[PDB]
Amino acid sequence: KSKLPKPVQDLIKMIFDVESMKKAMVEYEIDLQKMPLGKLSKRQIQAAYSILSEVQQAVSQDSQILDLSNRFYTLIPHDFGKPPLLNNADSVQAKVEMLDNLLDIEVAYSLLRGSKDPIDVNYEKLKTDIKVVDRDSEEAEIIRKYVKNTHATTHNAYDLEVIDIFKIEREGECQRYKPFKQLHNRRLLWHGSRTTNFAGILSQGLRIAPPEAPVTGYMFGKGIYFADMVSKSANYCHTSQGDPIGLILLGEVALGNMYELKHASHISKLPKGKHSVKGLGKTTPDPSANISLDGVDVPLGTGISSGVNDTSLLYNEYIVYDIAQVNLKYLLKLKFNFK
Ligand SMILES: NC(=O)c1cccc2cn(-c3ccc([C@@H]4CCCNC4)cc3)nc12
Fold it and tell me: What does altering residue 126 to P do?
């Protein structure tokens, strides 16, 4: 019998939910006999990204493309009960999205399958210390206020309800973050992801897309993205009426000198002296309402006009291009109340 608090036990069950992993594979139309969870590999996913990149290169420049489309389905077997040809941009992005999720699903399954309560054994595999933040604490009030105040006006499909607040420490992240611990402009920001990705995120941290993956769909190039508006990140949990509970991170991000951009720029190397990109939004949390939570700026102010009209973005976003610039601090379990 596990001594872990019930919210921690319930979080471990959510994270290693095989049913959720299989349902996702069914939704992606993956053939679960030819490609069961146990047969997914890192080398297979790496090669599939390369094929999707090759697919775009061939399309940009019909027999040549069909061979690439067929090599993709041979590597990742699907069950269509005819296979849709990988020619249009939406078809390629749908497959990249599938791989991005399969990558962490592979991590979750490999951990799980690789005398004690199963919940305890699987908790230890995450190599992450997880503690419940009390509802009556100063931290919980600051965090609830951050959720409350930064829900965007255009994101009106749902209301957000905080279920549990966890304080997290990934093993080895302290050591990895040490070169950036004293960098200026450290901010507490949101990062949403599908619930099926959290086993991978807790065990391996937030990661950058591999070079093999297509460059399309990355407004500021391959990096780790964050928002200062909870709903902007909460949209990336991909919660539905079917699964209305999502997970969202609060990470301390060492932004340093921000390369401030109003439009897309596929960053390969930042300008010298710049440590991050700030995508400028039209609406920003009121800077006069910034609070410090144990030395880190928490931009929990209600949204006001940023005074920037000539931008592609409604809300800010922040990108770092080195995995070491992130130190995960909190993990929230959120209820999405769909309207
Ligand atoms: N995940 C977040 O909380 C987040 C916050 C703010 C801006 C963000 C932008 N992203 C983002 C998420 C996904 C992607 C691509 C989309 C197409 C498939 N490959 C990944 C590019 C950017 N994630 C963000």
Answer: 1.5% of wild-type activity
End-to-end CA distance of the chain: 40
Domain count, the chain: 2
Q: Which residues contact 269 (CB under 8 A, 6 or more apart)?
A: none
Q: 126, 155, 190 — which closes off a domain?
A: 126
Q: Do 279 and 329 fall within a single domain?
A: yes
3-state secondary structure of 336: strand
Resolution in A: 1.7
Method for this entry: X-ray
48 CB-near residues (< 8 Å, 6+ apart): 72, 75, 76, 95, 99
H or E, element range at 192: strand 186-193
Among 110, 126, 142, identify where a domain stops: 126
Same domain, 6 and 80: yes
The response to whether residue 218 sits with its C-beta less than 6 Å from ligand 1 reads yes
252 is catalytic: no
Q: Phi and psi of 258, rounded to 5°? A: -90, 135
Residue 226 contacts residue 317 (beta carbons within 8 Å):
yes
Q: Which atom of ligand 1 is nearest to the CA of 226?
A: 5
Q: Are residues 18 and 120 in the same domain?
A: yes
228 CB less than 6 Å from ligand 1? no
How far is residue 30's CA from residue 24's CA, in Å, rounded to a whole number?
Answer: 9
